[PDB]
Design a protein around this ligand. Structure first.
Ligand code: FES
Lengths: 128, 126, 307, 68
């Protein structure tokens, strides 16, 4: 079956000093917010309270996730990721405004959830 | 709340409301229930629960600050900075039919340090 | 007084070595008054009182133990293959100088022949740290199963939940045979609503009730054989008390699956107060096989976020 | 009706380790409502209302002050 290989690196470190990766499974692409809600990984952080989110429409920058090596199978920004978050390191997307695409999809996108409240920089490779 | 708070005002409001017009009255009581709802929501989001900002699930600088030394002491490192792309978790895990496992992507999750502005003074009384 | 020898050799500012009723024992005290009663030469922790409230009595007892029986109560680490490997009480300290007053560490050391089990108990201001590391020396790959079983007492019996093992599949699996048990694996799976073999069920609740006998291991190590994403279960959960308003969190490092053990109604036959839970991560449903000479690192951290 | 509002806010925001309610009922609150499909429109409409100020702020900044 077509299984996209999310990694979902958590924001905080382990107390040992290594990151903890969870490697979620869910099929295809419908919304990244629905995948992170369904497969039980921590999207919102402190905004995970019930009325602390816009329930998927994009009117709040609360589902933001740093995505690295995520130029392969992803939709472009819907002028809401371009507007809610503006002065960012440009690898940050809204899970309720991004989508990893079609159900026939294989890929190794790795997503750092909660780019707010983190301490690592990921040392991104310079494109082009 | 009648004994130790203010209730008799709203009691007189709804008492003067229900003998006036039936349209305005039950929606006023419904908004009173909503008012109790959001005010208790405000009180719970402010005072009841963990802090949501110094919470060790959330803040990475907090996890870097509490753990001044690791869990092994003098093992696994002299400390490690520049933790690399440990997708395989150093388990030498081989790949089945998939898109990619390794590539020309060499990105090390270089985390921040410890033992610097370590205190993070908790919110004391004014 | 062998603990006096450890005191004038390795004793430090927050480290107090104690020897009463010819039992070596150490008490770790970091700056915020956090008490940690580690029984020496046993790799077994009795008591743990970190500052939860903001009083002078902010310290609260976390681990369950009775007053007299030090072998029956508290978190003890256990290593099997399939017999008990570390039952020899030859545990000795290796180094202590870790940090001044804020964070402490007592690392013990033994030797089971091919396995050099040195064992770290650290005291941070918010967390107990329990760290196992073995090291092969002989020419034999050992197929060992580590185990760190903790016993967290709850003030009220109605207040029991783990808050966060939803979504991942669990299997009712009887625990490891520890010398520091509270319930045997024969009675841990007796008179429940999970069946005795490794039946599989998906947890569909964000918090689980620990009222019944139903005891299980969370995670899918049969999925681990595929070495795909394989749905790695979360390394954290918020165990709660609800009798008084505090909670705790357990973080594993190096382990894969996490066991909980609910005593159900059978807590009356040993103790009478402070209903507990037999919780900890193991490498049991798929064991670990290191090498003919390498080392393996597996750590467990119980933390509080109240302070 | 006020204590009903207290109770609805209490089961949603007061965490499990400090709430005074029985954990069977507290478990059944999420067990009855783990779908977030008939909640995914209600929470959306209430949050968009409180965030866009009933759209009256946007309408006044669109056809009252920008009209001027
Ligand atoms: S939930 Fe409102 S930003 Fe995605």
């Amino acid at each position: 079956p077509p299984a996209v290989d999310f990694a979902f690196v958590h924001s905080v470190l382990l107390p040992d000093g290594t990151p903890d990766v969870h490697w979620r499974r869910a099929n295809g692409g419908q919304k990244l917010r629905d995948i992170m809600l369904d497969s039980n990984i921590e999207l919102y952080g402190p905004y995970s309270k019930p009325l602390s989110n816009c329930a998927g429409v994009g009117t709040c920058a609360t589902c933001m996730v740093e995505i690295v090596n995520g130029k392969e199978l992803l939709n472009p920004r819907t002028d809401i990721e371009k507007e809610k978050l503006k002065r960012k390191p440009k690898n940050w997307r809204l899970a309720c405004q991004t989508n990893v695409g079609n159900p026939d999809s294989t890929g190794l996108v790795v997503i750092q959830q909660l780019p707010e409240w983190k301490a690592h920089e990921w040392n991104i490779p310079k494109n082009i | 709340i009648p004994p130790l708070a203010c209730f008799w005002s709203k009691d007189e409001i709804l008492n003067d409301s229900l003998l006036f017009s039936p349209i305005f009255a039950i929606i006023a009581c419904s908004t009173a229930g909503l008012t109790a709802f959001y005010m208790f929501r405000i009180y719970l989001l402010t005072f009841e629960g963990h802090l949501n900002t110094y919470f060790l699930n959330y803040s990475g600088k907090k996890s870097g600050s509490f753990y001044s030394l690791s869990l092994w002491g003098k093992e696994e490192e002299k400390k490690l900075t520049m933790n690399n792309t440990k997708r395989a978790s150093f388990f030498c895990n081989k790949t089945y039919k998939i898109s990619n496992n390794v590539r020309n992507q060499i990105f090390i999750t270089v985390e921040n340090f410890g033992l610097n502005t370590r205190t993070f003074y908790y919110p004391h009384e004014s | 007084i062998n603990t006096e020898k450890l005191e004038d050799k390795f004793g430090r500012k927050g480290i107090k070595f104690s020897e009463s009723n010819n039992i070596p024992m150490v008490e770790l005290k970091v700056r915020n008054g956090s008490s940690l009663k580690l029984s020496l030469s046993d790799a077994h922790v009795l008591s743990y009182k970190p500052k939860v409230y903001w009083k002078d009595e902010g310290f609260e007892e976390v681990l369950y133990t009775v007053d007299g029986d030090e072998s029956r109560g508290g978190v003890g680490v256990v290593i099997v293959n399939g017999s008990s490997v570390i039952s020899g009480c030859d545990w000795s300290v290796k180094d202590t100088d870790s940090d001044a007053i804020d964070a402490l560490q007592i690392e013990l050391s033994c030797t089971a022949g091919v396995l050099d089990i040195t064992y770290i108990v650290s005291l941070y201001p918010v967390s107990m740290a329990t760290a196992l590391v073995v090291k092969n020396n002989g020419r034999k790959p050992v197929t060992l199963k580590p185990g760190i079983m903790s016993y967290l007492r709850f003030k009220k019996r109605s207040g029991a939940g783990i808050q966060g093992l939803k979504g991942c599949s669990y299997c009712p699996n009887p625990p490891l045979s520890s010398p520091f048990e509270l319930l045997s694996p024969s009675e841990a799976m007796k008179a429940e609503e999970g069946e005795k073999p490794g039946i599989w069920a998906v947890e569909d609740s964000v918090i689980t009730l620990l009222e019944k006998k139903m005891s299980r291991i969370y995670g899918a190590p049969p999925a681990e054989r595929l070495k795909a994403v394989y749905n790695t279960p979360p390394s954290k959960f918020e165990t709660i008390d609800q009798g008084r308003g505090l909670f705790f969190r357990m973080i594993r490092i190096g382990f894969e699956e996490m066991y909980v053990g609910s005593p159900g109604s059978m807590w009356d036959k040993y103790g009478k107060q402070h209903y507990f839970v037999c919780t900890g991560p193991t490498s049991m449903l798929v064991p670990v096989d290191v090498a003919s000479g390498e080392t393996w690192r597996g750590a467990m951290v119980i933390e509080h976020d109240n302070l | 009706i006020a204590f009903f509002g207290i109770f609805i806010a209490y089961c949603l925001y007061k965490p499990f380790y400090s709430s005074l309610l029985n954990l069977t009922l507290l478990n059944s609150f999420q067990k009855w409502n783990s779908k977030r499909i008939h909640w995914e429109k209600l929470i959306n409409f209430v949050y968009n209302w409180s965030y866009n100020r009933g759209y009256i702020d946007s309408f006044f900044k669109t056809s009252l002050i920008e009209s001027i």
